[PDB]
């Protein structure tokens, strides 16, 4: 499957693509404002994520640090990134279907649109100013708006027992971005697309 990753932000981002134990395609790349990066994702990929990283410094060997979304200091991510990270999530060719969603479960750093470029399903978007509106206790100094599980590490926010409800913090993310997951047991906002669809992830779509 092809993913086109487009940076419409006025600032540079470092895109990342991983399935948690391996890079997807090259795993990461710098995207200046306006740049597009096309990656190929193997069919059947389960649990892939794409996210943006902000304020990165990397040396010639691809080693460095980012203020949001850092994946163990590598330009080319093999693992998932440190919150806060707005997440495009996907599982492809699962019994004939693709499933896509945007998640705020690991916080929010950059607004995002996640849309198919082939026919047969709709896209999802979280483009509100969550960082500007972020509650004081969730604000991350590096930038971004953390989720409550990251900040407070309780069974309720992290849903560790498999029973948890919405919270004041999850409802904040949900109020600004209803089409993104706001906590682990949120009513799902997954979209079902035809198997082997292609997609575009746009940072700062508005």
Strands (E), 64-169: 64-68, 87-94, 97-103, 112-116, 124-126
Report how many domains make up the chain. 1
Q: Reported resolution in A?
A: 1.8
CA distances from 193 to 83, 123, 176 (A): 27, 10, 25
Instruction: Please check whether residue 179 is in contact with residue 126, taking contact to mean a CB–CB distance below 8 angstroms.
Output: yes
Under DSSP, the state recorded for 136 is G
**Distance of alpha carbon 154 from alpha carbon 201, whole angstroms:** 32
Under DSSP, the state recorded for 154 is -
CATH of the domain at 6: 2.60.110.10
90, 5, 19: which is closest to 52 by C-alpha?
5
Q: Which experimental technique did the depositors report for determining this structure?
A: X-ray
Residue 5's domain comprises 1-206
Task: Provide φ and ψ at 94, rounded to 5°.
Answer: -100, 100
């Amino acid at each position: 499957a092809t993913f086109e990753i487009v940076n419409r932000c006025s600032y540079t981002v470092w895109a990342a693509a991983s399935k948690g134990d391996a890079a997807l395609d090259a795993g990461g790349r710098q995207l200046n404002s306006g740049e597009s990066w096309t990656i190929n994702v193997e069919p059947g990929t389960n649990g892939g994520k794409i996210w943006a990283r902000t304020d990165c410094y990397f040396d010639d060997s691809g080693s460095g640090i980012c203020k949001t979304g850092d994946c163990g200091g590598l330009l080319r991510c093999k693992r998932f990134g440190r919150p806060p990270t707005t997440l495009a999530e996907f599982s492809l060719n699962q019994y004939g279907k693709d499933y896509i969603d945007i998640s705020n479960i690991k916080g929010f750093n950059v607004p995002m649109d996640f849309s198919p470029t082939t026919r047969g399903c709709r896209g999802v978007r979280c483009a509100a100013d969550i960082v500007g509106q972020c509650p004081a206790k969730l604000k991350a100094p590096g930038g971004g708006c953390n989720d409550a599980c990251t900040v407070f590490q309780t069974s309720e926010y992290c849903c560790t027992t498999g029973k948890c409800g919405p919270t004041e913090y999850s409802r904040f993310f949900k109020r600004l971005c209803p089409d993104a997951f706001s906590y682990v047991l949120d009513k799902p906002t997954t979209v079902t697309c035809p198997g082997s669809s292609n997609y575009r992830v746009t940072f700062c779509p508005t």
